[PDB]
Amino acid sequence: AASWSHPQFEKGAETAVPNSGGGELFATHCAGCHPQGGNTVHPEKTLARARREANGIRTVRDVAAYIRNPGPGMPAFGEAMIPPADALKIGEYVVASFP
Ligand code: HEC
Numbered sequence: 774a775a776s777w778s779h780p781q782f783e784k785g786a787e788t789a790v791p792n793s794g795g796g797e798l799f800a801t802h803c804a805g806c807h808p809q810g811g812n813t814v815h816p817e818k819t820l821a822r823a824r825r826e827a828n829g830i831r832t833v834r835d836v837a838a839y840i841r842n843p844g845p846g847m848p849a850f851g852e853a854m855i856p857p858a859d860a861l862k863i864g865e866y867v868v869a870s871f872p
Pocket residue numbers: 799802803804805806807812814815818819820824825828830836839840843844845846847848850863864867
């Protein structure tokens with residue numbers, strides 16, 4: 774934006790980003806408390822499939838919903854921090870990763 778800079782018709786360059794990967798997003802937002810799918814804050818609440826499913830957290834979209842209003846000691850993630858597409862990726866990684 775110099776004095777001589779011209780108007781543009783082009784728009785939306787800002788949002789032309791790659792889709793982030795689930796593993797990286799997990800490492801960034803979750804692995805601190807859930808390393809290797811465990812739980813360092815509440816030891817009984819691991820991400821092991823049977824345990825997630827005991828509370829009805831069965832699918833990718835169950836994960837992506839759970840993080841919006843989770844249990845004590847876990848922060849809630851709203852949609853500015855973890856947009857819907859990113860929530861799905863994190864759900865995918867949880868389901869693909871922790872038996
Ligand atoms: C620590 C500050 C946490 C961060 C960051 C994340 N989680 Fe978490 N998680 C944490 C606690 C203390 C608990 C137990 C809450 C309770 O009910 O007592 C959990 C639980 C989960 C679960 C399972 C819920 C259940 O079985 O009832 C899941 C599926 C889960 N957490 C996923 C998850 C994801 C995907 C995160 C990053 C986006 C994440 N957690 C962050 C502690 C913390």
